[PDB]
Design an enzyme around this catalytic site. Structure first.
Site, mmCIF file in Angstrom:
data_model
loop_
_atom_site.group_PDB
_atom_site.id
_atom_site.type_symbol
_atom_site.label_atom_id
_atom_site.label_comp_id
_atom_site.label_asym_id
_atom_site.label_seq_id
_atom_site.Cartn_x
_atom_site.Cartn_y
_atom_site.Cartn_z
ATOM 1 N N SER A 1 -11.914 10.928 -3.643
ATOM 2 C CA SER A 1 -11.367 10.617 -2.335
ATOM 3 C C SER A 1 -9.852 10.447 -2.435
ATOM 4 O O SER A 1 -9.267 10.424 -3.524
ATOM 5 C CB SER A 1 -12.006 9.345 -1.778
ATOM 6 O OG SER A 1 -11.668 8.209 -2.554
ATOM 7 N N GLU B 1 0.813 -1.209 0.000
ATOM 8 C CA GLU B 1 0.000 0.000 0.000
ATOM 9 C C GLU B 1 0.851 1.265 0.000
ATOM 10 O O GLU B 1 0.525 2.224 -0.701
ATOM 11 C CB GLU B 1 -0.938 -0.002 1.203
ATOM 12 C CG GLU B 1 -2.066 -1.023 1.132
ATOM 13 C CD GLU B 1 -3.088 -0.729 0.043
ATOM 14 O OE1 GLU B 1 -3.024 0.365 -0.563
ATOM 15 O OE2 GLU B 1 -3.952 -1.599 -0.206
ATOM 16 N N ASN C 1 -7.851 9.056 -5.489
ATOM 17 C CA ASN C 1 -8.686 8.077 -6.167
ATOM 18 C C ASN C 1 -9.544 8.764 -7.226
ATOM 19 O O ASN C 1 -9.801 9.970 -7.167
ATOM 20 C CB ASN C 1 -9.589 7.365 -5.160
ATOM 21 C CG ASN C 1 -8.805 6.665 -4.069
ATOM 22 O OD1 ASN C 1 -7.812 5.985 -4.338
ATOM 23 N ND2 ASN C 1 -9.244 6.829 -2.827
ATOM 24 N N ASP D 1 -6.416 8.317 -0.383
ATOM 25 C CA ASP D 1 -5.917 7.304 0.540
ATOM 26 C C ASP D 1 -4.698 7.849 1.275
ATOM 27 O O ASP D 1 -3.835 8.483 0.663
ATOM 28 C CB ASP D 1 -5.488 6.047 -0.215
ATOM 29 C CG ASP D 1 -6.641 5.288 -0.830
ATOM 30 O OD1 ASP D 1 -7.819 5.551 -0.517
ATOM 31 O OD2 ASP D 1 -6.344 4.381 -1.631
ATOM 32 N N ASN E 1 -8.911 5.288 3.257
ATOM 33 C CA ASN E 1 -9.640 6.087 2.283
ATOM 34 C C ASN E 1 -10.580 7.080 2.959
ATOM 35 O O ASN E 1 -11.375 6.707 3.831
ATOM 36 C CB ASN E 1 -10.446 5.120 1.411
ATOM 37 C CG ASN E 1 -10.992 5.753 0.151
ATOM 38 O OD1 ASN E 1 -11.150 6.963 0.064
ATOM 39 N ND2 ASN E 1 -11.299 4.918 -0.838
ATOM 40 N N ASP F 1 -12.645 8.744 -7.747
ATOM 41 C CA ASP F 1 -13.890 9.318 -7.258
ATOM 42 C C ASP F 1 -13.691 10.627 -6.503
ATOM 43 O O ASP F 1 -14.677 11.224 -6.063
ATOM 44 C CB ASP F 1 -14.670 8.298 -6.411
ATOM 45 C CG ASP F 1 -13.959 7.933 -5.105
ATOM 46 O OD1 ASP F 1 -12.859 8.462 -4.825
ATOM 47 O OD2 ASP F 1 -14.511 7.106 -4.346
#
Ligand SMILES: [Cl-]
Ligand SMILES: [Cl-]
Ligand SMILES: [Cl-]
Ligand SMILES: [Cl-]
Ligand SMILES: [Cl-]
Ligand SMILES: [Cl-]
Ligand SMILES: [Cl-]
Ligand SMILES: [Cl-]
Ligand SMILES: [Cl-]
Ligand SMILES: [Cl-]
Ligand code: NA
Ligand SMILES: [Ru+3]
Ligand SMILES: [Ru+3]
Ligand SMILES: [Ru+3]
EC number: 3.2.1.17
Length: 129
Positions: free
Chosen positions: A50, A35, A46, A52, A59, A48
């Site tokens: 959002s 990650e 991301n 991380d 998220n 959308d």
């Protein structure tokens, strides 16, 4: 902070992640490796809108507040910046909530695609635990 492999394993163990919800310590170290490459400061946007955050790429769509993810939740009740600290406490406490929500570690795409089913114990090999 970029943790060493065994340094992160020890910190995760002290904070109670070893075997949390049945997931051995190596699963957690492997997830963090893919990650974030063990970098607490990692951030990734991301599609959308959002973002991380941190060593486990938590998220903002559901788990933390960053003020720029409209309609999102903050289920860990923290600013997303808290997930970037050199102290992993906030990331661990939030990860415990995520992994308890029903889908286990499948919440972490890198875990599902790169750790699940593998010899995850290799990630803690040699560490004094
Ligand atoms: Cl470093
Ligand atoms: Cl270093
Ligand atoms: Cl180390
Ligand atoms: Cl390392
Ligand atoms: Cl070392
Ligand atoms: Cl490594
Ligand atoms: Cl390595
Ligand atoms: Cl928001
Ligand atoms: Cl599970
Ligand atoms: Cl992922
Ligand atoms: Na949010
Ligand atoms: Ru280094
Ligand atoms: Ru080391
Ligand atoms: Ru390394």
């Amino acid at each position: 902070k970029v943790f060493g492999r065994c340094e992160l394993a020890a910190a995760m163990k002290r904070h109670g992640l070893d075997n949390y919800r049945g997931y051995s310590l190596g699963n957690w170290v492997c997830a963090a490796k893919f990650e974030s490459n063990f970098n607490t400061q990692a951030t990734n946007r991301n599609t959308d809108g959002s973002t991380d955050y941190g060593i486990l790429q938590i998220n903002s769509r559901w788990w933390c507040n960053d003020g720029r993810t409209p309609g999102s939740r903050n289920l860990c009740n923290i600013p997303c910046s808290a997930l970037l600290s050199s102290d992993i406490t906030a990331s661990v406490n939030c990860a415990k909530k995520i992994v308890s929500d029903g889908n286990g570690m499948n919440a972490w795409v890198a875990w599902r695609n790169r750790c699940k089913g593998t010899d995850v114990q290799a990630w803690i090999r040699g560490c004094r635990l």
